[PDB]
Design a protein around this ligand. Sequence first.
Ligand SMILES: C[C@@H](Nc1cc(N2CCN(C(N)=O)CC2)nc2nc(C3CC3)nn12)c1ccc2ccccc2c1
Ligand SMILES: C[C@@H](Nc1cc(N2CCN(C(N)=O)CC2)nc2nc(C3CC3)nn12)c1ccc2ccccc2c1
Ligand SMILES: C[C@@H](Nc1cc(N2CCN(C(N)=O)CC2)nc2nc(C3CC3)nn12)c1ccc2ccccc2c1
Ligand SMILES: Nc1ncnc2c1ncn2[C@@H]1O[C@H](COP(=O)(O)OP(=O)(O)OP(=O)(O)O)[C@@H](O)[C@H]1O
Ligand SMILES: Nc1ncnc2c1ncn2[C@@H]1O[C@H](COP(=O)(O)OP(=O)(O)OP(=O)(O)O)[C@@H](O)[C@H]1O
Ligand SMILES: Nc1ncnc2c1ncn2[C@@H]1O[C@H](COP(=O)(O)OP(=O)(O)OP(=O)(O)O)[C@@H](O)[C@H]1O
Ligand SMILES: *[C@@H]1O[C@H](CO)[C@@H](O)[C@H](O)[C@H]1NC(C)=O
Ligand SMILES: *[C@@H]1O[C@H](CO)[C@@H](O)[C@H](O)[C@H]1NC(C)=O
Ligand SMILES: *[C@@H]1O[C@H](CO)[C@@H](O)[C@H](O)[C@H]1NC(C)=O
Ligand SMILES: *[C@@H]1O[C@H](CO)[C@@H](O)[C@H](O)[C@H]1NC(C)=O
Ligand SMILES: *[C@@H]1O[C@H](CO)[C@@H](O)[C@H](O)[C@H]1NC(C)=O
Ligand SMILES: *[C@@H]1O[C@H](CO)[C@@H](O)[C@H](O)[C@H]1NC(C)=O
Ligand SMILES: *[C@@H]1O[C@H](CO)[C@@H](O)[C@H](O)[C@H]1NC(C)=O
Ligand SMILES: *[C@@H]1O[C@H](CO)[C@@H](O)[C@H](O)[C@H]1NC(C)=O
Ligand SMILES: *[C@@H]1O[C@H](CO)[C@@H](O)[C@H](O)[C@H]1NC(C)=O
Ligand SMILES: [Mg+2]
Ligand SMILES: [Mg+2]
Ligand SMILES: [Mg+2]
Lengths: 341, 339, 341
Amino acid sequence: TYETPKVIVVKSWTIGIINRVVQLLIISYFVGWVFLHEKAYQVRDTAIESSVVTKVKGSGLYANRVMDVSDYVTPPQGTSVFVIITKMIVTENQMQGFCPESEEKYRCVSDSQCGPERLPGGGILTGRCVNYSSVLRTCEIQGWCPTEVDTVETPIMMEAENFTIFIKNSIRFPLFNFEKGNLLPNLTARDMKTCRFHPDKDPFCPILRVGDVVKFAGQDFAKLARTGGVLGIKIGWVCDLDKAWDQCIPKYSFTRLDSVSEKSSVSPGYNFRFAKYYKMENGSEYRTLLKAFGIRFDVLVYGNAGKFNIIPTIISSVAAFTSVGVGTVLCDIILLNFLKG
Amino acid sequence: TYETPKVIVVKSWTIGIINRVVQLLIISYFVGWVFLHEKAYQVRDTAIESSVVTKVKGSGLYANRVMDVSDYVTPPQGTSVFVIITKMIVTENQMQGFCPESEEKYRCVSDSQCGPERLPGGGILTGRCVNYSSVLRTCEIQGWCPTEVDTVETPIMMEAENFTIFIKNSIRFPLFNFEKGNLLPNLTARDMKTCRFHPDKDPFCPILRVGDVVKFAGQDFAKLARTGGVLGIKIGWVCDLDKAWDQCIPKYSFTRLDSVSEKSSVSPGYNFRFAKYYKMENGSEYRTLLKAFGIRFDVLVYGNAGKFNIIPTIISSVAAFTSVGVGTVLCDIILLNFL
Amino acid sequence: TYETPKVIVVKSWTIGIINRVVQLLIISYFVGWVFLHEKAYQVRDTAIESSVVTKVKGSGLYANRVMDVSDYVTPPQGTSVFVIITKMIVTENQMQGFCPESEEKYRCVSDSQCGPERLPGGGILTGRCVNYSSVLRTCEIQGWCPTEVDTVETPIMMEAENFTIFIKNSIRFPLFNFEKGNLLPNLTARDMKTCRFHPDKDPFCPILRVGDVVKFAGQDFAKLARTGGVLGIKIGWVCDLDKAWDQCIPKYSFTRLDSVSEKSSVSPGYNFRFAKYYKMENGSEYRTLLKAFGIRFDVLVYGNAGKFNIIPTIISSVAAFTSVGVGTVLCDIILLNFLKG
Ligand SMILES: C[C@@H](Nc1cc(N2CCN(C(N)=O)CC2)nc2nc(C3CC3)nn12)c1ccc2ccccc2c1
Ligand SMILES: C[C@@H](Nc1cc(N2CCN(C(N)=O)CC2)nc2nc(C3CC3)nn12)c1ccc2ccccc2c1
Ligand SMILES: C[C@@H](Nc1cc(N2CCN(C(N)=O)CC2)nc2nc(C3CC3)nn12)c1ccc2ccccc2c1
Ligand SMILES: Nc1ncnc2c1ncn2[C@@H]1O[C@H](COP(=O)(O)OP(=O)(O)OP(=O)(O)O)[C@@H](O)[C@H]1O
Ligand SMILES: Nc1ncnc2c1ncn2[C@@H]1O[C@H](COP(=O)(O)OP(=O)(O)OP(=O)(O)O)[C@@H](O)[C@H]1O
Ligand SMILES: Nc1ncnc2c1ncn2[C@@H]1O[C@H](COP(=O)(O)OP(=O)(O)OP(=O)(O)O)[C@@H](O)[C@H]1O
Ligand SMILES: *[C@@H]1O[C@H](CO)[C@@H](O)[C@H](O)[C@H]1NC(C)=O
Ligand SMILES: *[C@@H]1O[C@H](CO)[C@@H](O)[C@H](O)[C@H]1NC(C)=O
Ligand SMILES: *[C@@H]1O[C@H](CO)[C@@H](O)[C@H](O)[C@H]1NC(C)=O
Ligand SMILES: *[C@@H]1O[C@H](CO)[C@@H](O)[C@H](O)[C@H]1NC(C)=O
Ligand SMILES: *[C@@H]1O[C@H](CO)[C@@H](O)[C@H](O)[C@H]1NC(C)=O
Ligand SMILES: *[C@@H]1O[C@H](CO)[C@@H](O)[C@H](O)[C@H]1NC(C)=O
Ligand SMILES: *[C@@H]1O[C@H](CO)[C@@H](O)[C@H](O)[C@H]1NC(C)=O
Ligand SMILES: *[C@@H]1O[C@H](CO)[C@@H](O)[C@H](O)[C@H]1NC(C)=O
Ligand SMILES: *[C@@H]1O[C@H](CO)[C@@H](O)[C@H](O)[C@H]1NC(C)=O
Ligand SMILES: [Mg+2]
Ligand SMILES: [Mg+2]
Ligand SMILES: [Mg+2]
């Protein structure tokens, strides 16, 4: 039971050429694009297990003091997100009590203006108008006193341009049981004493200089250090597991993540507050309040791998034979009207 | 050499109508579902690069003291996960030494009951029984003394309902080099001074009120503040790049994430311990231990975008043409067997 | 206006059995692989919403002191990632001033050797050279003094083997509106009082012991606690929503994540520094510096679910009928060449 349809042959006369040309065009597309370029003959994996450990080094001088890594890096646990502080405003010896507010927003002349109103922001309002200075009068509050003044101008820590960052990374593709890290076996204890990362002269040393990371992202240090920002470091593992074990290597990229802040005029940077707590010999308690500007780094990891396997080869190859057989038959029917016309 | 197979024509309009109806049905399905609704003529992109910066404001009174953002928020770095503390239990001036244990599950009547048997809790057992009070007798430990009492009832900080959260977000689609943030160009300082988020009256102000978030999640503040919980805030960027640049818009949603806690009866909330360390003029050291209940927020960002292209259009058009031809040929034999 | 092709039937004994066998094989492949093993008749969902809360308990002796959870666990907010400290090196009462260095990499003979040219990350090199001991001479710096000594040997805290970890997890599949947690409805306080996890004797108690986790990962505590490392805990929710509600359960797995460290000789572990700040009755400020080695745990959640629907069923059935119809038509042309040959 063949059950094969009948077919009639036609002398070419510039029609048989069209038969072979199209029959050869489609067989080109599968070999050229589906197999050789898109690599449809192998199984892909995109779920990657990763791990990042970081460490920073360097010292600087700021406000008649020396600051080391325990002073300007928060949080200290060496994770993949951390901040480097480049500018601070400091208020010393705050205690609980009553004091006048310092900002221009809280101006009053008599006791009536500020009571239960003006509720957004500000501590608890007592309900009196007092003299902040000779020419200014503001409403009294209850809280930590004295209040801070953040309108003055302070210098930045210029030495932070030379600090170094050390990144240690490990990956694993669970489907193929493949493991590698970014510390290559060619790295010796003597090399790490002097190497620095450079994208073409030394693409594998894990030590990055802070001033260069800002440079590769197209920014300016003297301006980013004064308002703060967020920078990203990306590591990519795109590997073909047929070739060899030592052809799998990482690639680094750099960019700036908080792109809205450059063009905005209502919120241009990045800052936060924190405090340190003390206690006297008596029970009294006081603290120190700091407002900090800085640059936030974070490391992002991605990748995928492929390896030859028999099952996707058969499935895609069968579709190739089906496509040419079906493709011609439909091309025959459309050519019947073309030949009839 | 076209080599077209022979074709037989059935003059019956009774079958011609069915042939035409089926062909129109198939072409209708392709032109309506694959193209217009599913938008198969454009290239998708789902890998989004994001960034979140937050800040909190407000003051309240608790235990005859005024507390502010450096007191009730932890960790202080302004990331996308943070906690607001609404209730505390405080133990003052702990030092190292020997003391009895306060809990009733450590009851004893002689030196023999508690030895190396029960390992955890407090510190290291010493092997003696001592009077905790006039009616209770637990057995002694070594560690920070005195131990904390956990069963008393403390009030919550009611003013935490009015605190405000400010969220700043930025995205980028690397395939199309598209960048936008949730601070629209219409925003000004005067608007910043008074706006508040509302899903229909003001859907774009970045300032959120805590009570409103708890309300939108469908919860009750007087219970969430007493047991603790986890709430989620979601921002979605689903926009089409063929239209104008000023119609890619964020959408906000709210929900509660630790849904098992309210059902369960063995662990109903969220709490933790932390301490503060001091030192005397002499070398001696002491500390203050705190157990804190609170609400945890975290911001989640997702999205995808598409843009018209040529290659998917060509592929889908060729698929439609070949499906028309193949669908006809099989239906030809189908009616050939039927009739 | 209907159309049909013409069919030729040849009742060859071999051809009939061949085409029936091939058609049966195609039907078998569709009914066995596509609809049964692969479950093509249902809709998938892989976006999962999760939440994790942890808590640790235990006490131990270390350097004539008793330590508890507020001392050995950082950070303290009970999130997915945390560290347990097993070894420390402590420097007491550091203050600002001038002092000589301690590391052997800073030796002198005369003042001219170490100046601005040698940048070692030292806070500053005042430019002199001073006696450190009776047989060593390094050159002076400015910063927190005295500097720390890093090469001595310290014991590890062995009681950390018996600490316990409590994990509370909640998931939700938004598509099907499905919610469940890892605290099963038949868990009581009395069971909570004494249960421990065991992969076959008790697979649902959420209390894990640290030594058991280290063993399941395939490691050795006596040296993991001495160098440091990173371990992973995985929870997987893979369940079918056609069955009963109480058949969706979690599965636990354990592994080590920083696999590059054990095979390397330039960076074998995981450590970091942090500090505690004090100040006297005067303004004088001093601190205590600690270098910590530990084990970092982190919890990873994943899963997917499926549920019966009608649209994928219709699509797959139509595809199966078309492939059967196309398969017969295509093969017979191919079989004609076999029949002709
Ligand atoms: C191969 C390409 N798309 C295509 C399909 C096609 N057909 C479908 C099969 N078929 C049948 N089952 O009878 C014959 C008709 N004909 C075509 N002709 C062309 C030439 C550019 C003009 N591309 N192309 C593809 C599809 C589906 C694929 C699915 C997974 C991975 C790769 C694919 C890759
Ligand atoms: C179009 C729809 N699935 C379908 C396929 C089909 N065939 C395969 C192609 N083909 C050939 N290559 O000869 C003819 C036979 N015939 C059909 N008939 C129907 C009507 C509902 C009843 N849906 N449908 C699809 C598939 C694959 C798709 C792949 C990517 C994106 C969208 C797709 C969308
Ligand atoms: C079924 C299998 N792949 C296959 C396709 C095929 N085509 C279909 C279109 N078609 C048409 N439109 O005429 C006839 C030609 N023919 C085939 N023959 C074989 C032989 C067993 C090796 N596998 N196989 C598949 C495809 C597409 C699928 C899409 C989604 C999920 C599962 C799929 C699973
Ligand atoms: N949680 C909040 N509630 C109300 N207003 C806020 C909040 N956070 C920020 N703002 C307002 O948004 C504007 C931009 O904030 P920005 O990040 O620039 O703070 P800043 O101006 O650097 O310092 P400050 O905290 O004193 O405003 C500020 O004018 C501030 O008043
Ligand atoms: N790591 C752990 N090891 C052993 N038991 C634990 C652990 N964590 C919690 N539990 C027990 O689980 C129960 C539920 O704890 P929950 O999260 O409600 O904290 P809690 O009731 O405040 O416990 P505690 O008062 O001990 O902090 C408690 O009875 C506690 O004893
Ligand atoms: N940011 C950095 N800049 C320069 N060198 C670094 C940096 N981080 C680490 N190293 C060097 O890498 C080597 C391996 O680091 P690792 O942290 O494992 O050693 P370590 O014993 O902690 O060193 P150290 O005691 O100096 O911190 C060390 O010799 C260290 O000097
Ligand atoms: C950092 O090092 C450079 C030399 O590489 C030096 O010129 C510069 O002064 C240093 N940075 C600062 C701001 O001191
Ligand atoms: C080590 O191998 C890498 C990758 O092949 C190579 O780029 C590098 O130069 C090698 N290093 C040495 C010192 O041979
Ligand atoms: C405690 O003593 C300090 C001086 O050491 C004094 O300033 C303070 O007012 C006293 N506090 C109280 C509550 O008496
Ligand atoms: C918050 O402000 C409202 C007025 O807007 C006030 O009525 C309310 O009492 C405040 N919250 C609390 C709990 O005090
Ligand atoms: C700013 O632009 C958005 C559209 O991007 C618009 O919906 C909004 O109303 C504008 N702002 C105001 C305050 O009108
Ligand atoms: C140190 O002095 C304090 C009083 O200031 C005293 O209580 C303590 O016992 C002394 N230290 C020790 C270890 O005895
Ligand atoms: C933990 O408890 C076991 C008994 O269950 C005990 O033998 C062991 O010594 C304890 N751990 C350590 C290292 O002390
Ligand atoms: C609780 O139910 C599970 C099945 O959901 C069962 O395996 C387990 O044995 C039950 N608990 C006990 C203590 O038997
Ligand atoms: C305060 O006293 C300490 C000693 O306790 C001394 O070192 C310091 O110089 C004094 N500070 C002032 C400002 O006199
Ligand atoms: Mg300000
Ligand atoms: Mg308790
Ligand atoms: Mg060292």
